[PDB]
Design a binder for this molecule. Structure first.
Ligand code: BZU
Ligand code: HG
Ligand code: ZN
Length: 256
């Protein structure tokens, strides 16, 4: 079934998820010169102080850190959003080399990886309902460049040993996701989709302008995970990123 390999990669997904060819597919290239500065855009409000992480999991596609989304603990509001969106999980997409890995590109520049903090609109009751809605999800996207070490990422890097193969999970309580945020919360926003199957066109994408840097040692560790389950032939989990999609009559708005 789907993946990122020659035989089941992005170029094939349309055969089972026809929406892959739709009107607001993600990721896209942010062309800085034609993005419209919008002054009606409010600041983001990220309230991650009371977030409760529970578990990290290798799901065969990436590793996800999941959060308890039963009460308004970590929420995103403001920006292009109306309403409150709950953090349910975060994951990354990364490359096999440092000059690729981001899904979204900025003027065709690709970053080493990209963090997605997935949120769902609480007005819809539960996550599974939010994914049937045009404005059901908001994903906060953060570019990562190789440079200095990010202190708050180390905690995630250490556990990766425990979850090397598909289907393994480790408990991962008390992680503060605030340690993954940049200094500036300036962003670009546009309406788009999930970048993995089922490729649903449910998302307001908030892509922050400022990257976080991680060391090559940290993102190296990402590259040692496996797409395979235990006892299957080993395939290193790298390049789990979808290429940019045509913007097809959408306008990327900028808060700056
Ligand atoms: C491996 C599948 N990843 C999916 C899993 N999604 C659930 C989809 O099915 C709901 C019925 S999700 O909302 O958690 C989600 S957000 C992103 S991304 N890259 O666009 O930030 C991918 C995915
Ligand atoms: Hg949708
Ligand atoms: Zn993602």
């Amino acid at each position: 079934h789907w993946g990122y390999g020659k035989h089941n990669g992005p170029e094939h997904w349309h055969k089972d998820f026809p929406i892959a060819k739709g009107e607001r597919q993600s990721p896209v290239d942010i062309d800085t010169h034609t993005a419209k500065y919008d002054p009606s855009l409010k600041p983001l409000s990220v309230s991650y102080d009371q977030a409760t992480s529970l578990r990290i999991l290798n799901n065969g596609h990436a590793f996800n850190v999941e959060f308890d989304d039963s009460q308004d603990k970590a929420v995103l509001k403001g920006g292009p959003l109306d309403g409150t969106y709950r953090l349910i999980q975060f994951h990354f997409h990364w490359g096999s080399l440092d000059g690729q890995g981001s899904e979204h590109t900025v003027d065709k520049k690709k970053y080493a990886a990209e963090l997605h903090l997935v949120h769902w609109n609480t007005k819809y009751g539960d996550f599974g309902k939010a994914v049937q809605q045009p404005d059901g999800l908001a994903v906060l996207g953060i570019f990562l460049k190789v440079g200095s070490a990010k202190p708050g990422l180390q905690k995630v890097v250490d556990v990766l040993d425990s979850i090397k193969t598909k289907g393994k999970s480790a408990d991962f309580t008390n992680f503060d996701p605030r340690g993954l945020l940049p200094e500036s919360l300036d962003y670009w926003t546009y309406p788009g989709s999930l970048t993995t199957p089922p490729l649903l066109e449910c998302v307001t994408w908030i892509v922050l302008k400022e990257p976080i840097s991680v060391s090559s040692e940290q993102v190296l560790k990402f590259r040692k995970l496996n797409f395979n389950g235990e006892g299957e032939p080993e395939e290193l989990m790298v390049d789990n990123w979808r290429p940019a999609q045509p913007l097809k009559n959408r306008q990327i708005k900028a808060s700056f």
